[model samples]
Target chain A: MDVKAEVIEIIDELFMEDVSDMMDEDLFDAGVLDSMGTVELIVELESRFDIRVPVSEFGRDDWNTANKIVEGVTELRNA
Target chain B: MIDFLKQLPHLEPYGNPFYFIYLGIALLPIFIGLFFKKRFAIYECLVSITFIVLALTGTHASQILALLFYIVWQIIWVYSYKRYRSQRDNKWVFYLHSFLVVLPLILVKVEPTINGTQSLLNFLGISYLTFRAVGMIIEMRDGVLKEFTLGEFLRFMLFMPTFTSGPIDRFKRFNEDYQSIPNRDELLNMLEQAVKYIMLGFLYKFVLAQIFGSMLLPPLKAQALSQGGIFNLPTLGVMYVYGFDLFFDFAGYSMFALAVSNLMGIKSPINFDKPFISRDMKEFWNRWHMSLSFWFRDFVFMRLVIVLMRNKVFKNRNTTSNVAYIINMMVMGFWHGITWYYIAYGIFHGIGLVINDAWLRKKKTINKDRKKAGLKPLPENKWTKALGIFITFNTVMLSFLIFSGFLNDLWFTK
Candidate 1:
């Protein structure tokens, strides 16, 4: 699957409510993402993309959306 | 007892409504002083010491030495471990220091079950302060915590509000609020929230919890006690009754702590967010005793998952998560006590949450495929919600029944 598609699917499983309009919005601020969801997302990324995202490096700005997460992982992957 | 208290000028914070009269008077000058100077460091320190002295001096004066020693121990370990963390990355050192931090709490919780006596290291607010200290250490190990100071540490851990129990605040967040005074408009809004929380606390703690726990529960408990190990209807009824009683009692105290913390311009986390309405056990924990749950989640569960996954300890993701859940929850239960019921309750919820997550994952996976074929949203409406509420409520009520020791009393109470 494409990165965007994979990210959306990952997010779809994490959130119960329809987050179609919230694709680019702050999931934490929109009350969509929680600690469990964040950890799940991180684990999924590590396994799928083979990129280790350190927990200490977590910041709202770094992961506010699916696009942000994809981009952040890509940067880490490239790095 | 009365005569001793009279001489000590003890102002036990939130022991009763009268507890606040003394607190309000003590805090008034600090409040006014903050309004003018933004932050009156010494005045605030004086107020903190006075109240802390009052808190530790009252009926629990016996524990003051324990508390002083506890604080000193934490101070020494916190600083030494912090220095080591800054110097190098050694897992053994980290684990050892972290273990030492919780050793007192572990002894306090465990000794009662075996020795039938309290640990000498136990003191008022030990658990709450321990959580704060542990949080600092964890953050430091993670390299997220960049600074630590004695003044900030003392103020954060020993903040008068939320002293007995806690809506556990993070050190960084607490330090920020401690260092800065709220402006006029912000202070007024904070005052509004404080008053609202206190009033709600009074209703929940004194009025509602009083009726449920004191008035309604006693007779029901007597009936359960009267049953003498026989399984009967009233024992089941005590589940709902005691669950609500527990909720109102603990949640009420949390509200009072948060209210006073807000008045002091620190936003302590809220505990109960209407837990009984939760759709599942996972949702239930997310809402109930939120601060403690979050602490355990962040500090224990998340870290455990990271280490397990990093070491490839488990082949499958689900297994890793499931194991983490069981361990995390059992630790929380054991923290409550070293009792069979508490341990069992933890295991039950641990398994319950694991199953719930697995089911949710499967449902979402299937739903995604169905949606690709132009299916409407899954069958979720008021009826399903009501059904979910009913099942979750009954499941949680039973767990609370185990937690309450009512069933044990039903069997063991002579």
Candidate 2:
């Protein structure tokens, strides 16, 4: 729950849009996350959660949605 | 029949007007097959090999052996990397494999500078093929491309239509089409589009490029040289004419490649999309040589941005993106050839993009503030758009002039 809230908050602040309701939507498809935006999101998450998302490991298909991003961060944290 | 076939001239792929006639006759059976939703995979494979062999014969015979060794070397790396990834996902191993895969291309690109002659390893389509191979390795590491097969690898590598120059199709995308047969209706659509693209290619390449390149450019270049200065009427004429010549020649060739790929039911990606009308340098990239730009965006620029940001290499996000843009374009420049003009062209576009992004961001903030103050936001009408097109078009043409290396000839040629 903490990770989810943190992920949502990071997206809200970084992207300047509240994605709380668009959690299941493909953020990339929704034009909410672009290439540069994706890097910024990674930067925020890495610092906030202290989890690693190596450039090669960060596949768009896996981290395309808000929930998927939360899952990615959680998985990385757990590992 | 065998003697007759042997007596036929070996022509480079799409080299001359006669080449299309030969291609038309050769592709007739595949076209007929596709009309009924049948893909003549065996026949198509033979055609691909025949075309490669044709391109490599006569003066290019030595390149055949080079291509053979190159293919085997790439196969070893692709399969070995595929195997290594399954066992372990170490970054260093991935880097090593990536480096090994691209080593030949690096050598070929570098050898010209060293010896002032073409490298023995250099063959047609080496750059495009290397891009494809490196892309596969990266995707494998990304876990998006888990499966690798030899048949698919060969087809993807040597897909004759886009072999020498490419719209750079991905493995998964190409495989999906390669493994499936389009319905009769879809095949018909593809054929119709193919005909349209080929016709446009004729107009662009044979008609328009001939007028500009063959008819107009030589005289303009001569006039510019005789005039003997960087800034002159003839020099300006040379820039505009050369720019259009480059565009038509390249875009025309790309159209033919796309047409052939469509005829074969491959549905390769589009390489150009009205690039001249793009509103900004950033938008120019989106429309120009789109496949190469997108590949670099995905593989190089994005990766650099990620690594830099993730490591806090730059404190500001803008600085990170700006730095990545320059390095990315410089790499693209290096890839073009280790020439000053090409490198300058890349840097020119890199700086152009940075300025383009900055102005866009500034405009955004200005509009935001204007909105808050109940002032009408900055104009978003046709005039602004036309102005944008004007600026972007001129900027791009100037960059192309640099790319043409004409300035070096005009000012620095000894």
Candidate 3:
């Protein structure tokens, strides 16, 4: 799946909400993702994409939005 | 003969009316103190002597030891505060100080296990006071404490009313009203509240708990010894009774503490505020033993969060926060008493919190979708609230089973 699709799937799983066309950056404010939800997402991303998201790379700034989560995942994948 | 008489347990009920009598007696001196307010030394001596006498007669040796430990614990924390006063920003030392204080408490709780090595160690109210002392030390280190007067510190540690079972008063709040002498109207109002709470406490302990105990304890003891050892249905039933027993017992003690403190014109913090009525684990915690919960949050969880954030471990802030919750809950469980069962109890609650967090996250997602779909808002339902109460009650009961050493014994023989 593409980054947006994957992000949407994870968001649905974490929050059990529909977010097909929602903006990635809206996750934090919408409360669809809290601190723990963010962690679970990172773990899901790392395992699915064959990447390592170091503890250092996890933060509100990095995972506040869907795009950021996808970008963080991609960076970890490449690294 | 005298020794025998002393050794025989005082079966006489220390009931609600008895406490009032003591309250009336205790008030005579307070009135005297007010009359001689200028002669502060004499007033202080009289008050001190009265409490000392009460402590000697009203409390057990275990309680006295706990009180003494509280005094020493305060002294050590005060010393740490003085030593670290200049270095305002560093909190590592404060964490270290907390760990050090908890060490002795852990040791005291476990010391009874030493075979044939009888030490003058008893847990008693040590758990309550230790938490208070540790919280104070951390707060002082964090610059939350405005003043560190010896008089205030001593009073906080040894406030005879709360010295036994506490609402674990904060230093700042305690100091604010510690010296206020209640006027006649205030005194009467306080006495009424005190009697009401203490009577409720007695009702809980003697009536409710005893009724439940009469129904459950015999069967529980028999089942434990018999071939059928705690299967699912029986265990669940027994747990329900145990839950009621625990709530009433602890709530009773807390009310007694509040009543006694209020009678003395000192407003003790309310420890329980209808906790069972809470709709979730988080809310339940906020209502039950509120003082201790906040103590753990302020002293342990917040500090751990800061440390993790500083060290870049919280880069994935979510994971770091989760770890902090687990650590705080585990430490809280362990602090209750230094037993394996207590450790298990802590881990159980820690995991429960994690699971609850996960569920809430899931709920948020579903709610978002429902809003977008424009579905009628979910009815204000009782299901979640009822389920949460049931689970919380059972979990607490199971914890008490562990706490009571029943689980430990089961593990040992098996």
Please give, for residues B121-220, the per-residue lDDT of candidate 3 as tens digits.
Answer: 4434566667656656655554455466666676676566565566887766676665666666776787789779877988987788777777676587
- Check candidate 1 and list the clashing pairs: none
* Best-matching candidate per DockQ: 2
| DockQ for all models | 0.18, 0.41, 0.06
Lowest summed lDDT over 10 consecutive residues: which window, candidate 2 chain B?
B1-10
* CAPRI quality band, candidate 2: acceptable
lDDT of candidate 3 over A1-79, digit per residue (tens): 6866776777677579876766654777887865445545656665677654444213346466667666766665544
lDDT of 1 by residue, B100-119 (tens): 98889988988888899889
- lDDT digits (tens) for residues B237-347 of candidate 2: 989999999999989999999998887877997889999989888889989999899888878998888788767788786898999999999999988988888999989
Stronger candidate by lDDT (1 vs 3): 1
DockQ of predicted model 2: 0.41
Candidates' TM-scores? 0.86, 0.90, 0.72
True contacts kept of each: 0.08, 0.48, 0.08
RMSD of 2: 3.7
Calculate candidate 3's fnat: 0.08
**Candidate 1 chain B, run of 10 with poorest lDDT:** B1-10
TM-score of predicted structure 3: 0.72
